[PDB]
Amino acid sequence: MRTADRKHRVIVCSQQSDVDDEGRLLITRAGVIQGWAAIAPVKAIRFSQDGVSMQKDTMQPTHDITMNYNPDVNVSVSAWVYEHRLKSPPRWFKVLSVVNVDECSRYMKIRCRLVETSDDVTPPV
Amino acid sequence: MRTADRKHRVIVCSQQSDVDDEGRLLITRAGVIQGWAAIAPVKAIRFSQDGVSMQKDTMQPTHDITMNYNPDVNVSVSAWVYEHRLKSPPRWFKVLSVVNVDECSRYMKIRCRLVETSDDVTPPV
Amino acid sequence: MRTADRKHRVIVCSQQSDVDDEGRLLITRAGVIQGWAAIAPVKAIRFSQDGVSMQKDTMQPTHDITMNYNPDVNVSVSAWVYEHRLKSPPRWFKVLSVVNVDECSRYMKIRCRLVETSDDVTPPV
Amino acid sequence: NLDTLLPLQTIREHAKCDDNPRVTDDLLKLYREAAFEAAELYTGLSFTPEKTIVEPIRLKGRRGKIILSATPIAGRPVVFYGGGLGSPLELIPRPGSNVLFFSQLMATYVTGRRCENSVPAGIIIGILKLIAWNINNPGDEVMSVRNTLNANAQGLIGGTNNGAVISGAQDEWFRYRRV
Amino acid sequence: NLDTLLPLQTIREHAKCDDNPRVTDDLLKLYREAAFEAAELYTGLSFTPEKTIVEPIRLKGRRGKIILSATPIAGRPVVFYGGGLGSPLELIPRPGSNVLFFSQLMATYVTGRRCENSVPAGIIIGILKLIAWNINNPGDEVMSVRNTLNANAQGLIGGTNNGAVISGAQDEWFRYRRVL
Amino acid sequence: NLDTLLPLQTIREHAKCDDNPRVTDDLLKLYREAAFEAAELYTGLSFTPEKTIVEPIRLKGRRGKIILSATPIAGRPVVFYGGGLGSPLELIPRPGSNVLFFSQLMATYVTGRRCENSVPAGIIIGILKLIAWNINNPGDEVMSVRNTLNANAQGLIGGTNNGAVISGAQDEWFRYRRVLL
Amino acid sequence: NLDTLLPLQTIREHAKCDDNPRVTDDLLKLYREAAFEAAELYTGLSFTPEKTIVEPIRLKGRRGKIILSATPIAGRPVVFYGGGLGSPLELIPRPGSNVLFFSQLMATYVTGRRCENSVPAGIIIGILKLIAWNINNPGDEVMSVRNTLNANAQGLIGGTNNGAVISGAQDEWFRYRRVL
Amino acid sequence: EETKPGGDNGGEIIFIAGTDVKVQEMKNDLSDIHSKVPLDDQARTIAGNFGI
Amino acid sequence: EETKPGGDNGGEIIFIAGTDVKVQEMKNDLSDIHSKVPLDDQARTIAGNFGI
């Protein structure tokens, strides 16, 4: 695709998980890759004041994110995508699958789902 | 959408609810946005004289409303759209989901449902 | 659509219903609007000597009737369409929904169903 | 006078517009009036009542050719006075045309038409068509053939949403014109 | 005042904007003002009762020819003074033509259309179209319509992207403009 | 000063952007003020009320001819002075035209439209069309009729529709310009 | 200094790069620092308000025409000194023009407009446009408009693929450009 | 029109800014209306028959 | 215009930077207005009839 279309700045993050000693569990999202990517919607969104999406299935992707393919990385089941904007509240996406576009190994198309978009998410570390 | 397509005057409203002391509840619908928007149908309508549309699923959108994007407003799960015409009764639309058209953040596409269109609806305050 | 295509003369009627004192009920059809409209089939028809259709679902429309939009009329759940021809037996349609074509408020498209077509229906009053 | 020529019922039944209040009687009267002032202006059959005129004549040639702005009424003396004359002269014009053959010179003829009837079916057909155009073809969305649209990269096709030419009348009246 | 000649209801009824407004009302007033000041100076027919003119003329056309700016009224005599004339001359013009035949030489008269019910129907119809065109053409779409064939050497898109040309307007209110 | 004869509210109502926070007031002011002179220079008409002028004059042609630069006024004498005159001489122009007849020859007069109720709707419609084109059509992609994006396999057609005066703006103002002769 | 003339937020709000930041601010100000070297290198005009200039003139055009390299304001007389001349002369220019009449002969006057001088907003809409076109045309996408009509000559894809002309800039800076 | 000999701007060019007008010059030869060739022949005939 | 004999820049070339103007040179033949051929014949005829 047009390299002037990759007009979204994202940070691909991996999830590190452990239980707090108090008994509950905690998830950390560490940023691994930073680049430009192009997102596009493939489904409507239910916002539910506070921002968090109201999708019921939680397995149907809602956005498609394409970026530079990278042969040394393995986008696992446990990768997130933190997208930051100028004057719009940041977003968290959860990856649901990847597809190597036409197997030409030039672009990865990440099928992901919008988790939440509100001004008070925890940015990566 | 060419800027002459937006040929409808709408009021986007957010509803507040409070319990009636006698035992009922009451929904106050107050306007938050008023601008020009372009609506298009995606389904027929069963009317039941006195206006109230007899749709059964109550989650399948019937009309799609496009208007100008606005990054600070967050169209909730509880937003309404009061469209008033000149020689036709007003209509109450209930939003069901929003689409950020192509993620260009220039237009919103609100999948909404036609609730009622009769000359005796409560306009928003 | 082409104004030379509206080549069918119809009378939109409303249904008035009451029970006969004998215990059974009676339905009258009073003609309210008379104009030219354009019909087109969207499903085959089962005739069953006597004329009456044999559709099982009784909710899938079979014909589409388009005519001049009229902002003051509300085509309810209880509207019929009586179509009279020259040398073909008259027909009765039952409306099942309406759609305001592209919401430009210039044409109403009535999704309707053919009830019966035989030489001995009761014309409107 | 027009209300006896075209009754609004014939229009509303031709243009198949009688059920939609968007086309009221005042606007349709405007349409039916703008279709008769262009029927007697491209064909010149003077559907205007009387309009007596007093203009100055400037005798043109040595054959003595008098030209007139508007045609006279075919049978009423066009009187000439002034310009040196001391006893006004009366001429009788030729029916249909506006040519005559003889301190400035003046002339005072009469124009228009008086009687109600004598409007041929040919004209009305053209007028019905012209109105049927205007009621559902305003000046937006320059169309193309079979009432379609286009994206012709070079330009567009032009002169398509002008009335009276794209539809009928201009050609349904020519049968009443000449050399 | 135009609301006598053409009320906004007839606009909203012709342009099919009765039901859906598509524009507020003051914008419609401005569009109507533009559309009545376009046909007016396009066909050369004024609308206000008069405007008495005083104009300095120059004799040309050795036969003796006077060209006026406006076009008299009709039967009213035009008067010439100054120039060297002992007394004001008085001529009578030809209806609808600013051509007359005879220390500066002026002329005064009045321009016409002192009634209101004289804009016959045409200028009203065309103006309806031109309004209708402006109601949906805020200047966003391109909508350029072709004129003569040969595509310009510069290789542009063409010419004549002109409201009240590419709409009905001209062909509508031209049955009045004279050809000479 | 463009605040009273083109209210920003009218612009925001014309181009239907009254809910866009991405067109701030300063940006709309820059558009409104860059289009009140990019299409005033083009028509050569000042917009202030009647505004006196003084300028030199050079006669042309053996029969005398004075080409001015304003189309001065209707019915008010333009006067000439200096340049071998012994007394200021007063000429009367003819409406619309800016040509006259009989130590540099000077001339003074007053151009403009009488009232402050300034430029007619014709001028304003052009600006409204030009602004609307400017706010929702930046110059970044070549367009085509309607607003399609073609291919052509050969050179694009987009000689002008990139950002030029494609809207009927430029041509509306012209109805007021004046073909010479 | 530039960002005082053209704030970065105005660039971004014009070119839609907001809530969707394409190339970062650094590249944005580089684009700006190059878009003032096409504009005002294509116009000839400079960056200073209401200057007064001094320059040697020549008298080609034996009759005696003078061509200035600016536009003297209306009313202020320009002065000619130096060369064969008893004392500085007083010529009042022709409004909105730079043609005059009658040991190096020099001339001085006051250019610009008397009032405040930004950068004539209007030769900025091209700069905004030239920036905009450069944000979504990094240089891998083949876009090319045609100038000539006929062809290249060989199977060449026409050509004007320049920018600042394909963007609507050249024809929005041209209003401040002399045509000689 | 006002370029005729002894006109206001007589002999100067015509500048038309926009809206190209198109002039075509008619010939109007009119230089053989009497058909000089099949006329002098008739003259030679009706002069020769008189023996001149 | 200012290239007439006795002008500022008379006789020098015209430079136009874009927006190509299109000049076309009119003939204005005017060299047969009186129709010399069907005129001298009439002169001869009304001469020959007087016997000269």
Author numbering:
A (entry chain I), B (entry chain AM), C (entry chain AP): 1 to 125
D (entry chain T3): 2 to 103, 124 to 200
E (entry chain S3), G (entry chain U3): 2 to 103, 124 to 201
F (entry chain R3): 2 to 103, 124 to 202
H (entry chain AK), I (entry chain AL): 264 to 315
What does the paper say about this structure?
Caudovirales, the taxonomic order for the tailed double-stranded DNA bacteriophages, is characterized by the presence of a tail—a host cell attachment organelle that is connected to the genome-containing spherical or elongated capsid via a neck. We describe cryo-EM structures of the neck, the neck-capsid and neck-tail junctions, and capsid of the Agrobacterium phage Milano. The extensive network of disulfide bonds within and between neck, collar, capsid and tail provides an exceptional structural stability to Milano.
The 15-fold, 12-fold and 3-fold symmetrized maps of the neck were used to build atomic models of the collar, portal, and neck devoid of capsid (portal + neck 1 + neck 2 + tail terminator + collar), respectively. Namely, the dodecameric portal ring (12 × gp7), which is embedded into the capsid shell, connects sequentially to the dodecameric neck 1 ring (12 × gp14), hexameric neck 2 ring (6 × gp15) and hexameric tail terminator ring (6 × gp18). Besides these conserved common elements, the Milano neck complex possesses a unique, external, sheath-like structure surrounding the neck and consisting of four pentadecameric rings of gp13 (15 × gp13) that we name the collar. In the dodecameric neck 1 assembly, the α-helical and β-sandwich domains of gp14 form the core and peripheral ring, respectively. The core ring connects the neck 2 ring to the portal. These loops decrease the diameter of the neck lumen from ~30 Å to ~18 Å. There are two alternating conformations of the lumen protrusion loop, with six tilted up and six tilted down.
